[PDB]
Structures are given as structure tokens and as C-alpha cells.
């Protein structure tokens, strides 16, 4: 992977590329399904970590913890 191809060599670079190349490959990956993947994926992955930790906690706890006008009737009787 080439690093930081700056601004304006391409019209010169494609001057040679187009004469050497036999087949270019162009990838089409949009942004919105990637972002939907980020949000849903961090939700499910962090819930997986939480589930593993809470299962370990509840098991180790259920194992370890059992091992451990006011002087009327007071004047005549």
C-alpha cells in the first residue's frame, strides 16, 4: 500500500501507468453500510464481553461465597 500520494503527480503518473498496466482493479465500498456495521458491531461485541464477564462472575461467586389532659386515669387506682 502506497503512503500519502500527495496531490498532483497522477496525471504524470497515469502517463506511465496507462502504458504499463494490463488490468486495474477498483473497489466499491460505500460508507453507510460500514458505519451501520460499526454501531451494530460494537454493540454486539461489547455485549459479548459483558456476557462472558457476568457469566464468569456469577459462576465464581456461586462457587466461592458458600465457602465463606394527661393525668385522668393515673390518680385513682
Amino acid at each position: 500500500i502506497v503512503d500519502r500520494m500527495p496531490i498532483d503527480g497522477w496525471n504524470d503518473v497515469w502517463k506511465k501507468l496507462h502504458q504499463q498496466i494490463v488490468n486495474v482493479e477498483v473497489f466499491n465500498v460505500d460508507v453507510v453500510p460500514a458505519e451501520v456495521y460499526t454501531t451494530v458491531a460494537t454493540f454486539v461485541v461489547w455485549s459479548m464481553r459483558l456476557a462472558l464477564f457476568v457469566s464468569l462472575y456469577v459462576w465464581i461467586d456461586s462457587i466461592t461465597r458458600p465457602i465463606y389532659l394527661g393525668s385522668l386515669g393515673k390518680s385513682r387506682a
Partner: peptide, 30 residues
Amino acid sequence: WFVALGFLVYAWRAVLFELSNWRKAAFAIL
């Protein structure tokens, strides 16, 4: 269980990522 099955088949590669990290961390701890 069925919506969980759908959600896990949906995100298979990221789940394999996290499981790989879990296994590597466990083997590094041991």
C-alpha cells in the same frame, strides 16, 4: 435465541475477530 442466531450470523467476521483476541489473550495469560 432466534434473533441472537440472526445477529451472530450477521456479524460473523467481527465475532471471529473478537474470539481470536480472546484466545490470544487467554494463551498470553496462561
